[PDB]
Amino acid sequence: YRLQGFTNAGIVAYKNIQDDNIVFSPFGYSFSMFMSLLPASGNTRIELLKTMDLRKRDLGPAFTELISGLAKLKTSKYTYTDLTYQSFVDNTVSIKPSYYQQYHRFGLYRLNFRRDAVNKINSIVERRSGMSNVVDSNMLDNNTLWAIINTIYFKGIWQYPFDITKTRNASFTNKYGTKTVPMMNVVTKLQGNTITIDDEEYDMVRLPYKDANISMYLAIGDNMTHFTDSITAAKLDYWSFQLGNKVYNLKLPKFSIENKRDIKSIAEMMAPSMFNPDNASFKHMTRDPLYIYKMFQNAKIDVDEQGTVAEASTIMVATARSSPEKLEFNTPFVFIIRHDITGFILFMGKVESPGSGLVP
Amino acid sequence: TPFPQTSKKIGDDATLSCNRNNTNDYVVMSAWYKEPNSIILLAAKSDVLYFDNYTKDKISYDSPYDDLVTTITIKSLTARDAGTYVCAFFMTSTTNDTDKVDYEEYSTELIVNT
Ligand SMILES: *[C@@H]1O[C@H](CO)[C@@H](O)[C@H](O[C@@H]2O[C@H](CO)[C@@H](O)[C@H](O)[C@H]2NC(C)=O)[C@H]1NC(C)=O
Ligand SMILES: *[C@@H]1O[C@H](CO)[C@@H](O[C@@H]2O[C@H](CO)[C@@H](O)[C@H](O)[C@H]2NC(C)=O)[C@H](O)[C@H]1NC(C)=O
């Protein structure tokens, strides 16, 4: 009844992002897919249990574990994580009375999607989570009948902040031949190591956050695709156990990334019937044919000398229009914001590293 | 009476408790919400997740190790603490018999007067 499959769902979702300018919330994707288990039934429920690597006997305790994990994200003010979950079902849908009695208090809203649904849903999400204009106008038509929104916000402050006295160094890529970017520099002791993963050298560093058990792990290596394709929750825990105190001259770029990615491919590889109106069985919520045809995530991260600010919104909706982005980074590094107690991976991505590397 | 009326004074500590009828299934969680669309807390065993503007200060969860009941205590009752309070049990099957989520819900009207 562990959440290993829960975290590995988002891990695989990240592993399927064919790009290098990535900023993703594995916890947001995993949480959406896991909350989908409440209305799901039959084949959809079985697929979701398979992807989470859970049985019907372990679904109850799993949620329990999840709740406990959620109880360990709002434990301070210096560093915290706020999570909100909203479901919007059309008034014409005949929701089962038991389902509504059980789950309507966890943000189940009813409206007419043909009467300015965009502004109403944006207002509800803004009132519940503070993030405004989460859903775009081209993601809602007069045909959509179901919309699930999952927002997560992480405010972080380095336990050992960078000195403002830093340099502005030029990173070398092929897209941007040479781009000058501010690079924070700090010489101090940190929990790191330089390990080998399947005969491949990777340097790992941990940056703790003040007044919390959340940490930003940084990994630097030759082929980051190899490091990406070989990470699981248990292997991540083992790598964390391999880290220890040692002196480091950290050169971390002051990066700010934003992504708006269609994740329908991986979500359909995990739950095909959820994205097919002929097989979509959500009989726990309603006997009416409901499905999801589009799934996106909008993520953003900003890192400075004081800390990190990250936002993410996972949206399951009926229609959308977007174009994929493809940037080829050379010799990048991978960051992972992880809760060291629950193993939750709140955020993770990939930033273009300077030619000198993160640890000279 | 559809709602037990718990009458208390300004400044008292109101201890609200509820009992689950199903005593043979695994309690997934126990929830407390203020019926005017306000979630107070969600207790998973001894881990309590407080929603909205709620902390361990005014409302304390008093039954972390007792699974057959759920109990909270509101401290220093004010005029805004009055209203309907709802306790709920989310339970699952222990032996995969009748695979479904069982749900219990009870309400009580707290009247805090001078
Ligand atoms: C970090 O690690 C564990 C996580 O449970 C914990 O010992 C530290 O503080 C704990 O917070 C827990 C709730 O998240 C709670 O069970 C407990 O009161 C407290 N434990 C203490 C003080 O020994 C976590 N640290 C921080 C800063 O959150
Ligand atoms: C707890 O469960 C028991 C057993 O189902 C309930 O006792 C019966 O309740 C029904 C209606 O809920 C009555 O028609 C029966 O007469 C009751 N007794 C028997 C012997 O069957 C009991 O009411 C439940 N308590 C609750 C829901 O608070």
Swiss-Prot record, chain A:
Organism of derivation: Vaccinia virus (strain Western Reserve) (VACV)
Database matches in PANTHER family: GH10112P-RELATED (PTHR11461:SF211), SERINE PROTEASE INHIBITOR, SERPIN (PTHR11461)
Main location: virion
Pfam families: Serpin
Entry superkingdom: Viruses
Homology family: Belongs to the serpin family. Orthopoxvirus OPG040 subfamily.
Function, in words: Negatively regulates superinfection and syncytium formation in infected host cells. Acts in concert with OPG185/A56 protein at the host cell membrane by interacting with and inhibiting the mature virion entry/fusion complex (EFC). This mechanism ensures that new virions released from the cell cannot enter already infected cells.
GO CC annotations, alphabetized: extracellular space; host cell plasma membrane; membrane; virion membrane
The UniProt record lists the keyword Signal: yes
The protein's name: Superinfection exclusion protein
Record membrane topology: Peripheral membrane protein
Quaternary structure and interacting proteins, as annotated: Interacts with OPG185/A56 protein.
Species lineage: Viruses, Varidnaviria, Bamfordvirae, Nucleocytoviricota, Pokkesviricetes
InterPro entries according to UniProt: Serpin_dom (IPR023796), Serpin_fam (IPR000215), Serpin_sf (IPR036186), Serpin_sf_1 (IPR042178), Serpin_sf_2 (IPR042185)
Compartments it resides in: Virion membrane; Host cell membrane
Curated annotation (Swiss-Prot), chain B:
Factors inducing expression: Expressed in the early phase of the viral replicative cycle.
Span of domain Ig-like V-type: 1-105
Localization annotation: Virion membrane; Host membrane
Sugar-modified residues: N21, N53, N96
PTM statement from Swiss-Prot or TrEMBL: Glycosylated; contains phosphate and sulfate-substituted glycans. O-glycosylation is required for hemagglutination and hemadsorption activities of infected cell membranes.
Disulfide linkage: C18-C87
Known role: Prevents cell to cell fusion by interacting with and directing the viral OPG040 protein on the host plasma membrane. The OPG185-OPG040 complex associates with components of the entry fusion complex (EFC) presumably to avoid superinfection and syncytium formation. Via its interaction with C3/VCP protein, protects the infected cell and probably also the extracellular enveloped virus from complement attack.
Subunit text: Heterodimerizes with OPG040. The heterodimer OPG185-OPG040 interacts with components of the entry fusion complex OPG143 and OPG094. Heterodimer with C3/VPC protein; disulfide-linked.
Family: Belongs to the orthopoxvirus OPG185 family.
Name by which UniProt lists this protein: Protein OPG185
Source organism of this protein record: Vaccinia virus (strain Western Reserve) (VACV)
Species classification: Viruses, Varidnaviria, Bamfordvirae, Nucleocytoviricota, Pokkesviricetes
Gene that this sequence comes from: OPG185
Full protein stretch here: 17 to 130 of 314
